Amino acid sequence: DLADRFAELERRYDARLGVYVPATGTTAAIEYRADERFAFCSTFKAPLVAAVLHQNPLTHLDKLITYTSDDIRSISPVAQQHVQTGMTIGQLCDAAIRYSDGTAANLLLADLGGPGGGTAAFTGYLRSLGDTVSRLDAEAPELNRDPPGDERDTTTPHAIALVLQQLVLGNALPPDKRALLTDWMARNTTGAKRIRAGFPADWKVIDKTGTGDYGRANDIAVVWSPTGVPYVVAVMSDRAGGGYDAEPREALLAEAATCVAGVLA
């Protein structure tokens, strides 16, 4: 029936939807199209920032980075103001998580090194986490625009949920570096209408959204029950049907999250 319900939401909203909540001690995994590739979009920033943290003294955050106005590529709510000033790595980390700024992400890929602008290093970070499925190949914003059926810059619900889970709840990071990342997510500003809107207001929710072309709209979150029991939730969607210009459907992500909250509850 939970399969039968996600597939209705797919009819109602005319989109592909993918769902993943890993198993815990007392609950089975929830999965609907958990292994199909979906575009990474802006969600990837959350592991990008773990990548940046797990490989540079906590003192690296204080490093100043200079860019030019030429550097800004896509959506940069934060970036434009500080261009003359510059931003530190820690300020970039924050802006990439709480605001999904394209430019900040761009720099922190450049700050990982290697070919592909950073994208080989970064996919390498994911591999270190046991994720052999995902891959990043472009920077902002070409990464949001690969066509349906194109493998590059794609993940699955299942893959990106097991990543998230080691970062936040797994010992993939030192307790202090772990606290930063969690706090940046706990204070995300881009996520009000997605997963957070599906869960009751007394569940704690921390997340990272993604939005793109072809009606792509993602959200990955770690939720805490009022009792303090944590779960990891990945929710992915798209609407290639309407082609490049298809509108993404948040209500979909937010509805799909209520079905999950009910199952968990």
Q: Is 255 in the active site?
A: no
Give the CA dihedral 6, 145, 87, 116, nearest 10 degrees.
110
Q: 4-8 long-range contacts, Cβ below 8 Å, gap at least 24? A: 5/259, 6/32, 6/256, 6/259, 7/32
Instruction: Find the helix or strand (DSSP H, E) in which 188 lies.
Output: none
- Nearest Cα neighbor of 256 from 133, 157, 134 is 157
- End-to-end Cα, the chain, rounded Å: 16
Selected catalytic residue, list 8, 36, 128, 142: 142
Q: Are 143 and 137 in contact (CB under 8 A)?
A: yes
Selected catalytic residue, list 42, 74, 100, 134: 42
User: In the Cβ-directed half-sphere of 185, how many Cα atoms lie within 13 Å?
Assistant: 28
**C-alpha to C-alpha distance for 45 and 75, rounded to whole angstroms:** 14
In sequence order, what are the beta bridge partners of 210?
Answer: 218
Q: Is 42 in the active site?
A: yes
Q: Supply the residues annotated as catalytic.
A: 42, 142
